[PDB]
Structures are given as structure tokens and as C-alpha cells.
């Protein structure tokens, strides 16, 4: 067996590199929100809670991980705390991520009421409430769901540990049924699936709204055809009534729809009197209102929904990379736990899976920079002005 300090040295050098980049990158996220009022919306308060958790990974959870890989003699419950602290920070990120998905779902489903429902003061109260539950979830082992009542006394002796001490190792003190049933299944997988449902519902909503617009637009332009090409009064009235509801429905900028419906009322009135050619010609005045007001709403509405879709995809990539960085390690615990006949994943793979999970704390800054113009532009200023 190769001197264990050769593998540890690599693992540790890598952990530190990752802690450095987690700190830098998420500091930049915070500095960017601090400085650009275009980034000071509720959604980004959760971005900031997320970046704080990732700063805390680099400043505390990674040094803790390095520590608890040595097996050092430690009081069992102090071992548990350096083992479990990172579970808190991770739970924090899961709640931020879920909050964000719900925020954008409210934003696209009821845009009209979002600013009176989703306020900065309520966001901050939700964040605080989430941090406190994260401490309760990730430190639950401290409350007694732990292996400190059944230490490995042979192992503690072979290391000369004091009395009451254990060799301090994540899997020796944190029970694996906590890690699998409670943490993984219930505190991680259930929320990720929820977030999956929510982003589903967001994309469906957006897809339905865009079609509604495109329908309303076609109701508008086809019912005109029916008018130009009629020779009967009632044909004109019928086609106009179907433009008016499709106009009021799209209304749900004002000069544009006032004129439009008013001109439709104008033409409806003419058509009820049997003035076919006089209604057909008043209808034609609508086309002028279409080109100048309605088609510009169609397009800005389309543009806003495409931006929400693009934004929601950017945030779902954050959640997928969270899942990618953490599932291997969860999957390993599931084998450790459910297959006592299987050999334990080898050390080298544990190294790989642990460092992989920690790299998640580096990736969010890059997503913002690659996918969110306002962040990317801010990031450039901060770098230039303070190289
Ligand atoms: C925390 C967590 C979460 C969260 N949040 C989610 C899923 C799984 C885990 C998680 C984490 C760790 C772990 C172990 N170490 C210290 C360390 C470093 C290098 C090598 C070694 C040895 C002794 C070789 O095993 N041990 N750091 N994290 N171990 C396990 N099974 N699960
Ligand atoms: C604000 C931040 C920097 C505070 C950080 C405090 C951290 C590093 C402290 C608080 C609790 C501490 C632990 C409490 C108890 C023990 C048991 C002892 O046998 C070995 C050290 C160990 C495991 C400590 C390690 C350091 C520790 C984790
Ligand atoms: C989420 C994406 C990246 C997929 C990740 C799947 C990974 C974690 C899977 C693929 C193959 C798996 C390994 C296959 C075989 C063994 C041997 C067994 O004795 C312990 C589990 C162990 C060591 C598995 C650990 C988890 C593993 C490495
Ligand atoms: C959406 C997906 C990623 C959710 C997570 C899937 C998890 C729960 C699945 C993926 C593959 C599964 C493992 C496949 C094989 C074995 C070996 C068996 O002897 C014990 C169960 C165990 C260890 C399974 C446990 C559950 C498992 C780890
Ligand atoms: C030690 C571990 C972590 C450090 C915590 C960092 C906390 C981050 C606070 C930064 C901040 O509030 O900026 C965003 C606001 O401007 C939003 O409007
Ligand atoms: C700025 C904020 C900085 C954060 C602090 C950094 C690292 C904490 C990890 C340190 C844990 C070290 C414990 C060592 C120990 O207890 O070793 C004695 C043992 O009994 C065997 O001799
Ligand atoms: C979604 C993930 C849920 C997957 C649940 C996987 C459970 C694995 C299991 O039941 O393993 C039993 C063990 O083999 C006893 O011998
Ligand atoms: C995934 C994120 C990037 C991973 C880059 C390299 C991973 C870091 C350490 C893994 C291997 C460390 C030890 C190598 C084998 C030696 C040993 O196990 O004793
Ligand atoms: C500041 C950066 C700190 C980084 C990691 C601290 C590593 C702690 C080493 C544990 C002691 C090993 C032992 O006592 O046997
Ligand atoms: C800024 C905060 C600085 C934090 C101090 C850093 C970590 C110290 C490393 C702990 C190593 C313990 C020595 C173990 C021993 O002598 O048995
Ligand atoms: C913004 C910071 C939020 C502060 C949250 C503090 C709430 C902590 C909630 C439950 C913690 C449960 C674990 C208690 C550790 C006790 C240590 C011991 O057992 O010796």
C-alpha cells in the first residue's frame, strides 16, 4: 500500500484549489448584485443566499472535509459537527433552488400580482426561515441520530485516541440510514423532483401563453378576411364579434386596444343596421390599428416570454449541475447502505466523488456569466475597474 500521504496530498491540493475558486467566484456574484440595481430583485436574493452557501463551502466545509479525511482523534460529537456542517449548506442551496423555481413560476403564471405577492421583505424572511431549517436538517445527527453511541473502540485505540474520542471519519459517525432515507431520498431527491415539476409547469405555461397570443393574432387577421369577403350583413357581424373577444382576451398599449375595440364597436354597429359595405370599410380601419399598435404588442409580448423561457432554462441548468455534482456520492452511499455484500467504492473514487460534489460551489458563477447578460456585463465592469 502506497504511503497514504501521497493520495491525501493530491486530494488536499485539489480541495484547496476548489475552495479558492468557490470563494472568488461567488464573491463576484455577490459584488455584482450589490452594485447593479438591475440585479437587486427577489429572484437574485436567492441567488445571493446560494452564493453565500458556496462561499461557506470554500471557507468552512472544504477545510472540514480535509480534516475529517485524516481520521484524527476527536470527541465524537465535535467530529459529528464538522462532518455534518456541510449538510446544512447543501440543504440551504436546495431551499434556495426550490424558492427560485417557485418565484419564476409565479412570475410567469400571474405576472400582474407578482410584485405585490413576492416582495423583498418576504423573500428575506423566507431565506432566513430556510437557513434555520437547513441547520435543523443537516445537524439532525447531532440531536442523536448518530453512531456516537457505538464507537469503533478498536480503531480509536490503534490511533491512541483519548478517552471518549473516536477516529474522526464521516461514515463512522453519520449513520448511513440518515444519509440515504432522510437526507438523500427526503431532503434532496423529493425537492429536486418538485423543482422538476415546477420548471415543467413553467415551460408549459410559457408555451401555452405564446400559442394563445399566436391564436389571438390569427383570430384578428382571419376574421378580417371574413369581413373583406362577405356580401351579407350578419357575416360581417359574426366575424367582428370574434375579433372583439379575441381583442379583449389579448388585452388581458391601451390606446392600441381602445382604438381597436372602439373601431370594432364602430363596425359592429354599422353591421347591425345592415350597412354591409359601410361596415366592411370601417373594419378596414382596424388593419391600420393592427400595424401600428397590436403587432408591436404581439412582438414585445413574444419577446418577454422568450426571455422568461431562456431565464428559466438558465436556472434549471443550475439545478441539473447540482444533481450531477452530488448524485454520484449519494449513489455511492446507497450502495454502501443497501448492498452490504458489495465492496465499498474504492478510496480513489471517493476522492473523485467528494471533490466532484465540492466543484458545484464553483459552477454557478459561470452559469450566470454564460447565460445572464446583466450578470455577465456586471462581471466585466468589476474585473476591469478592479483588475
Ligand atoms: C456530505 C454529503 C452530502 C452533502 N451535503 C451529500 C451526499 C453525500 C455526502 C457525503 C460526504 C462524505 C464526505 C467524506 N468526507 C471526508 C473525506 C474526504 C476524503 C476522503 C475521505 C475518506 C475517509 C476516504 O472517505 N473522507 N467529506 N465528505 N462522505 C459521504 N459518504 N457522504
Ligand atoms: C466563524 C467560524 C470560522 C467558526 C469556526 C469554528 C469551528 C472551526 C470549530 C467550532 C466547533 C469545533 C469542534 C468542536 C469539538 C471538537 C472536538 C475535539 O476533540 C477536536 C476538535 C473539534 C472537532 C472542533 C474542531 C473545530 C470546530 C469545528
Ligand atoms: C449522476 C451521473 C454522473 C451518474 C453517476 C453514477 C456513478 C456514481 C456510478 C456508476 C458506476 C457505479 C459503481 C459501480 C460498481 C460499484 C462496486 C460496488 O462494490 C460499490 C459501488 C460501485 C463503486 C458503484 C458506485 C457508483 C458508480 C460509480
Ligand atoms: C433520478 C435518479 C438519479 C434517482 C436516484 C436513483 C437511485 C435511488 C438508484 C439508482 C441506481 C440504484 C442502485 C442500483 C443497484 C443497487 C445494488 C443493490 O444490491 C442494492 C440497491 C442498489 C444500491 C440501488 C439503490 C438505488 C439506486 C442508487
Ligand atoms: C463565511 C461564509 C459565507 C459568507 C456569507 C456572505 C454573505 C453575502 C452578503 C452579500 C450581500 O448581501 O450582497 C447581496 C445584496 O446586495 C443583495 O441586494
Ligand atoms: C476565516 C475562517 C477560517 C476557518 C477555519 C479553518 C479550518 C478549520 C478546520 C480545523 C480543524 C482541526 C482539528 C485538529 C485537532 O483537533 O487535532 C488534534 C487531535 O487531537 C490530534 O492531535
Ligand atoms: C427514486 C429512488 C428510489 C429507489 C429505492 C431503492 C431501494 C433499494 C432497495 O430496496 O434495496 C434493498 C436491499 O437490497 C435489501 O437487501
Ligand atoms: C471531478 C472534479 C475534478 C477531479 C480531478 C482529480 C480528482 C482529485 C483526486 C482524485 C484522485 C486522488 C488520489 C488518486 C489516487 C491515489 C490514491 O487513491 O491513493
Ligand atoms: C485555513 C485553511 C485550513 C485547511 C485545512 C486544515 C487541515 C487540518 C488538518 C487536521 C489535523 C490532522 C491531525 O491532527 O492528525
Ligand atoms: C483565519 C482563521 C485561521 C484558522 C486556523 C487554521 C487551521 C489550523 C490547523 C489545525 C491543525 C491542528 C494540529 C493538530 C495536532 O497538533 O495534533
Ligand atoms: C443565519 C444563521 C441562522 C442560525 C440558525 C441557528 C439554528 C440552529 C438550528 C438547530 C441546530 C441543531 C443542532 C445543535 C448543535 C448543538 C451542539 C451539541 O450537541 O453539542
Numbering used by the authors: -1 to 208, 1001 to 1042, 1061 to 1106, 219 to 307
What does the paper say about this structure?
Etrumadenant was well resolved within the orthosteric ligand binding pocket. The 2-aminopyrimidine core is stabilized by π-π stacking interactions to F168ECL2 and forms key anchoring interactions by hydrogen bonding of the N3 and the exocyclic NH2-group to N2536.55. The relatively large Etrumadenant molecule requires a significant sidechain movement of Y2717.36. Notably, the cyano group of Etrumadenant in the A2A-PSB2-bRIL structure is slightly tilted, relative to the plane of the phenyl ring, towards the hydroxy group of T883.36 and deviates from the ideal planar orientation by ~8°.
The Gs protein-coupled adenosine A2A receptor (A2AAR) represents an emerging drug target for cancer immunotherapy. Etrumadenant (3-[2-amino-6-[1-[[6-(2-hydroxypropan-2-yl)pyridin-2-yl]methyl]-4-yl]pyrimidin-4-yl]-2-methylbenzonitrile, also known as AB928) was developed as one of the first dual-acting adenosine A2A/A2B receptor antagonists. Herein, we report two crystal structures of the A2AAR in complex with Etrumadenant, obtained with differently thermostabilized A2AAR constructs.
